[PDB]
Amino acid sequence: DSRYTKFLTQHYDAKPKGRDDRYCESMMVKRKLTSFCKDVNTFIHDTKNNIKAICGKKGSPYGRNLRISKSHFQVTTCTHKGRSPRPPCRYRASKGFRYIIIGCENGWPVHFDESFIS
Amino acid sequence: DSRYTKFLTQHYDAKPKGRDDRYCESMMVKRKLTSFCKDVNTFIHDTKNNIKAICGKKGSPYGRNLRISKSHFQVTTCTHKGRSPRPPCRYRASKGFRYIIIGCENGWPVHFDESFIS
Ligand SMILES: [Zn+2]
Ligand SMILES: [Zn+2]
Numbered sequence: 001d002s003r004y005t006k007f008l009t010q011h012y013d014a015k016p017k018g019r020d021d022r023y024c025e026s027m028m029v030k031r032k033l034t035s036f037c038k039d040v041n042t043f044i045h046d047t048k049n050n051i052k053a054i055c056g057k058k059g060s061p062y063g064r065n066l067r068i069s070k071s072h073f074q075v076t077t078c079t080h081k082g083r084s085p086r087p088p089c090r091y092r093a094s095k096g097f098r099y100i101i102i103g104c105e106n107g108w109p110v111h112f113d114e115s116f117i118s
Numbered sequence: 119d120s121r122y123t124k125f126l127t128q129h130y131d132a133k134p135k136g137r138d139d140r141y142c143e144s145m146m147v148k149r150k151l152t153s154f155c156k157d158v159n160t161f162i163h164d165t166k167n168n169i170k171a172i173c174g175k176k177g178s179p180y181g182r183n184l185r186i187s188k189s190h191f192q193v194t195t196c197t198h199k200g201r202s203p204r205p206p207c208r209y210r211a212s213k214g215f216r217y218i219i220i221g222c223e224n225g226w227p228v229h230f231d232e233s234f235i236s
Contacts, residue, residue: 039232040158064208065201079233083183083221090182092233103201114157115197115210116234 003110011112012051013043016076024078024091037080037089040114044100045074055104062101066113069099077114121228129230130169131161134194142196142209155198155207158232162218163192173222180219184231187217195232 009031017023028034033041044051050071053059059067075096082090103111127149135141146152151159162169168189171177177185193214200208221229 039156063199066199079231081181081184081231081233083223083229085229094234105201111201111203113197113199115199116212 001108003105004108007109007111008048011042011044011109012048013045013076014047016043016045019045019076019093019095021091021093023076024093025089028078028089028091029087034087034089036085037082037087039080040077042075042077042100042112042114044112045076051102051109052107054100054102055107055109059102059104062113065103065105066101067104068101071099072097073100075100119226121223122226125227125229126166129160129162129227130166131163131194132165134161134163137163137194137211137213139209139211141194142211143207146196146207146209147205152205152207154203155200155205157198158195160193160195160218160230160232162230163194169220169227170225172218172220173225173227177220177222180231183221183223184219185222186219189217190215191218193218 027043054067054069058070062068077094078091080089081092098117101113102109145161172185172187176188178188180186195212196209198207199210216235219231220227
């Protein structure tokens with residue numbers, strides 16, 4: 001599954017190396033998100049099985065093509081902190097344990113909604 | 119100023135047409151931010167003079183190359199709400215009146231920091 005694999009590349013990191021700003025700066029490069037300095041990207045620290053389950057009965061519909069998780073997930077959200085959109089890109093990390101919203105297609109996670117949840 | 123003009127294209131809208139989801143969807147296209155569905159982008163509803171002043175004495179240093187405004191600004195933050203990164207792109211709007219963080223170069227606004235402020 002192409003879109004599922006792309007989602008994993010962008011958002012899945014089961015054993016994160018530190019969850020700090022350096023982690024974000026390294027991972028944004030390693031996962032190919034710095035062609036321009038992408039402003040927001042969240043890495044999820046949990047199993048692929050648990051993330052995928054959000055697209056089934058362990059998620060709730062959250063408007064068209066979105067599902068919100070019924071369970072909290074450990075996450076690290078990387079946000080751009082520089083003045084230039086050209087790499088190298090500087091990031092701040094924000095750790096969280098919260099419900100997450102994902103875009104689903106035919107039972108598979110294909111996107112991560114990066115908007116604010118409170 | 120090329121980078122200043124780019125900033126204005128991306129972030130300046132003095133008389134916004136409605137500040138709702140449709141506003142976001144229209145403006146993200148009009149301001150050329152939907153080649154892929156950019157996940158977050160804020161439009162500022164104030165004068166160019168007031169925004170620029172953030173890069174001077176009406177801002178405070180907020181870490182390298184960033185300044186936080188001393189005054190609140192009316193803003194509409196557009197966030198992607200779809201499962202696909204390919205246009206057409208669907209958005210939600212979030213209106214705010216808050217301090218804003220911008221990236222400055224030689225006294226000119228050149229970037230908008232899209233991270234969470236509380
Ligand atoms: Zn940026
Ligand atoms: Zn998106």
